[PDB]
């Protein structure tokens, strides 16, 4: 998310 992480695996 905004201010954080977005992980696609």
Author numbering: 209 to 217
The study reports:
The result showed that segment 209GFGGNDNFG217 (named hnRAC1), but not the others, formed hydrogel at 4 °C. The hydrogel was composed of amyloid fibrils observed by TEM. As temperature increased to 25 °C, the fibrils disassociated spontaneously, resembling the behavior of full-length hnRNPA1. To reveal the structural basis underlying the reversible amyloid formation of hnRAC1, we determined the atomic structure of hnRAC1 in the fibrillar form to the resolution of 1.0 Å by micro-electron diffraction (micro-ED) and to 1.4 Å by micro-focus X-ray diffraction. HnRAC1 formed needle-like crystals that diffracted both electron and X-ray beams well. The structure revealed a cross-β architecture (or steric zipper) with hydrophilic sheet interface composed by N213 and N215. Moreover, the hnRAC1 structure exhibits a distinct feature of negatively charged D214 continuously stacking along the parallel in-register β-sheets. Stacking-D engenders instability to the fibril architecture due to electrostatic repulsion and hence is barely seen in pathological fibrils. Note that in the local chemical environment of the hnRAC1 crystal, D214 is in contact with the amino terminus of hnRAC1. In contrast, as we mutated D214 to V or N, although the resulted peptides still formed amyloid fibrils with no profound structural change, unlike the WT fibril, the mutant fibrils were stable and did not dissociate as temperature increased. Similarly, in the hnRAC1 structure, kink at G211 enables the aromatic ring of F210 to reach out and interact with the Phe residues from neighboring molecules via π–π stacking.
